[PDB]
Amino acid sequence: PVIDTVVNLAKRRGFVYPSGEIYGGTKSAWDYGPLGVELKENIKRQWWRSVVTGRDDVVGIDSSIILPREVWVASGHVDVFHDPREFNMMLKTYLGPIETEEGLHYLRPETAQGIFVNFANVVTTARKKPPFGIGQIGKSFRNEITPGNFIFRTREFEQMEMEFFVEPATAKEWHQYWIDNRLQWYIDLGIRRENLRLWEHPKDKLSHYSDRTVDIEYKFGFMGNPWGELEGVANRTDFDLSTHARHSGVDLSFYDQINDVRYTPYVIEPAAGLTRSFMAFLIDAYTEDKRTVLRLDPRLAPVKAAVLPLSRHADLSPKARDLGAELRKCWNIDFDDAGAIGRRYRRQDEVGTPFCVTVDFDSLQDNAVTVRERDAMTQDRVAMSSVADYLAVRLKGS
Amino acid sequence: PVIDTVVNLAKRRGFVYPSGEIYGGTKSAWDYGPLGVELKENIKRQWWRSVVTGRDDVVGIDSSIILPREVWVASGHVDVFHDPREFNMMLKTYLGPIETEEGLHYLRPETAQGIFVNFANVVTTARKKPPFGIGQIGKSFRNEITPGNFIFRTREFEQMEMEFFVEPATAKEWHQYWIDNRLQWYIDLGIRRENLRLWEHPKDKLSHYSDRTVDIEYKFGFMGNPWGELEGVANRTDFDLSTHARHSGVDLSFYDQINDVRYTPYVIEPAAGLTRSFMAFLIDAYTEDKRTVLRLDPRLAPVKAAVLPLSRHADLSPKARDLGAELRKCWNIDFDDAGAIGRRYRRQDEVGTPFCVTVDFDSLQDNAVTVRERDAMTQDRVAMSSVADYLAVRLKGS
Ligand SMILES: Nc1ncnc2c1ncn2[C@@H]1O[C@H](COP(=O)(O)O)[C@@H](O)[C@H]1O
Ligand SMILES: Nc1ncnc2c1ncn2[C@@H]1O[C@H](COP(=O)(O)O)[C@@H](O)[C@H]1O
Ligand SMILES: [Ca+2]
Ligand SMILES: [Ca+2]
Ligand SMILES: [Mg+2]
Ligand SMILES: [Mg+2]
Ligand SMILES: [Mg+2]
Ligand SMILES: [Mg+2]
């Protein structure tokens, strides 16, 4: 089972820790350790660049976890978000002094509703016109009945969701665009294409408001069926703005000044999972070749380079430490002088570090270092003054 | 009142929106709009670089909002975190099927406890030895009795907290180091030093476990007393690891292999507020000189450059759009061709954009553009092929 092996590596090296481990934990709750917080941040950076700020037609928001309760009546979650005896899967809390119906709030089960209710605000302040999107990354909460499979299905998780508002007659081509774009995003960041597939929902598996839904599925390797949903890309017609306009009383239609027409945009929704993606990138990268290597895209790898003096000899520290401080101004780096150099390469390979930089006794005469590439183990001798440039060309886009 | 004027600008331009505005909102709940999410991200980036990954002695974590309940008994929050009739300020929720004492959990009122309970995990996986720190950014929740003053004191907020673990005999010099370093961080990012001060807590205002606490205070401009706490920097002695070791039964002391000694580290804690800092940076940057200019540090400004064709003429779009696409690969940028150019400069000044790049009819012959600097309004004519380099030298560290 690749999955358990990857989970064990993730714990051993501090990608993750069980939350509250010393108190026995809480079911499905995982903390991100020193390497995990950096990998998670890198995934966020790549999504935000590809979907939001790298585009001229998508803007971002960060809306609150706790919204007014009526948001979740309008969205239908109060009446429908239940799994059987029906049990509602939203987490409740109480705000203010007394516990009353007025104080009752839900923690959001998805980030998307905070986008929809801000549609008119964003049109106004960002001066946007369909086709355009609003993207968001954040925490969501669900009282999952059977959480587990590591971080695949947890009660507290993070999503990366974008709502793309379009003229209704253009929705089918924009849906296809976003299906194609989102699938390719995973492949471009290194997931092997044979471990990804698309699942076109049959008509009898569509929501009442979706004209089409396609899931990107990843071959996680679960027992039984090894595939799982990674990201859902839905054509949500005009249901979301319509329902919030009806329940709130605020017009959420769009006025097209050029063609003087008013309409309610259709929505194409790429709904991805930050913590679920983290799991897929780790599993897919895990390789046993003997070598254990985490073949992470260099833009995702948590540590970009490790500075490794050949030994603890005092003559090598000045250079090695000076080099580490220079590189640390640019990237997250590691410094390690403990034990045999070959074992130190293997320690970095195991967590995906794309380059190791070795300072040896020849470095004291030629003022150069050896740079080792993780996967092929090529070793180039590089002038000290050129190491950062050498790394930068190979880490571009991080 | 500068504060109301800044809040109004923040709403009008989409730094913030009231959460769930169309449903009447919830007290103290603010969403971050297109400009606000970028400013908030930039503040996070600068803190994480200065306190965590730019250092060789601090690592990061991202622990769960919902931890095992016993964490908050051990920390003393269940018995002490109450304001009078006593009222506990932690937000509660229930996990799993039935609402039972076993299902009751608290949303974290601070991020620091998730750091302490992972001390031994981080020592193990990151191979750290005091003096070293663990930093974290994340959401915290408090049932504030009188929330308000915009985003200064809200029920849902974000903190930037680091716990610096030291040999006990070194705590006083490390405390002073971190006081000095954290104060200077705000000044380096552009807050005017006359609007910052330190408040040394008198002995009768210290917690039972703090040997010394110093607050960084900012002159927000509140009615009555215009100063407010911005960040607290406390020497927390050995209370935090000791209490968790006692309640959990897990030894959280540190073993020093070199000197073969075992001890419980003292803790120096810089506890900052991401959303409170956001407010201070905006207020301090707001300037009326007539001009309204948000004098934000270019590393914090949400939009780094705006590409502005002199007019909507079709001959200027090809170049202006090509230039925008080139710059967008590097930074968040804006493109605006609506209305008089001078009003468009002022629109960018109002949100802090450090540079405007104007494409005019002379650009079609000399293949150069004018770059305007926000504060002084200097205008340099810059070759198209050099614009990104020109901006990069001025945006270094973003
Ligand atoms: N309980 C969960 N734990 C982790 N990720 C989730 C969970 N539920 C949904 N996701 C992620 O969020 C995406 C959108 O979910 P949904 O809102 O159910 O369409 C999914 O494709 C997953 O990547
Ligand atoms: N209710 C709140 N809303 C926003 N920021 C807060 C709130 N409470 C505390 N903070 C921030 O968190 C820092 C540490 O808070 P404390 O945990 O109370 O020491 C403070 O200096 C503020 O910057
Ligand atoms: Ca678990
Ligand atoms: Ca409010
Ligand atoms: Mg959804
Ligand atoms: Mg689905
Ligand atoms: Mg605290
Ligand atoms: Mg305080």
From Swiss-Prot, chains A, B:
InterPro entries, per this entry? aa-tRNA-synt_IIb, aa-tRNA-synth_II, aa-tRNA-synth_II/BPL/LPL, Anticodon-bd, Anticodon-bd_dom_sf, Gly-tRNA_synthase/POLG2, Gly_tRNA_ligase_bac, GlyRS-like_core
Amino-acid positions noted as binding ATP in the UniProt annotation, renumbered to this chain: 142-144, 152-157, 229-230, 273-276
Gene Ontology cellular component? cytoplasm; cytosol; extracellular exosome; extracellular vesicle; microvesicle; plasma membrane
Q: Does the keyword Nucleotide-binding apply?
A: yes
Q: Which UniProt keywords apply?
A: Acetylation, Aminoacyl-tRNA synthetase, ATP-binding, Cytoplasm, Ligase, Nucleotide-binding, Protein biosynthesis
- Please give the residue positions where the record annotates the modification N6-acetyllysine: K329
Cited Gene3D superfamilies: Anticodon-binding domain, Bira Bifunctional Protein, Domain 2
EC number(s) on record?
Answer: 6.1.1.14
Catalysed conversion reaction: tRNA(Gly) + glycine + ATP = glycyl-tRNA(Gly) + AMP + diphosphate
Keyword Lipoprotein annotated: no
Which CDD domains does the protein's record reference?
GlyRS-like_core, GlyRS_anticodon
The residues the record assigns to binding substrate are E110, F157, E158, Q159, M160, E161, E269, P270, A271, A272, G273
Any GO BP: glycyl-tRNA aminoacylation
Tell me the compartments it is located in.
Answer: Cytoplasm
Single GO molecular function: glycine-tRNA ligase activity
Task: Give, as one word, the top-level EC class.
Answer: ligase
Under the subunit heading, UniProt states:
Homodimer.
What NCBIfam families does its record include? Answer: glyS_dimeric, PRK04173.1
Record family assignment: Belongs to the class-II aminoacyl-tRNA synthetase family.
Role description = Catalyzes the attachment of glycine to tRNA(Gly).
- Protein name as catalogued: Glycine--tRNA ligase
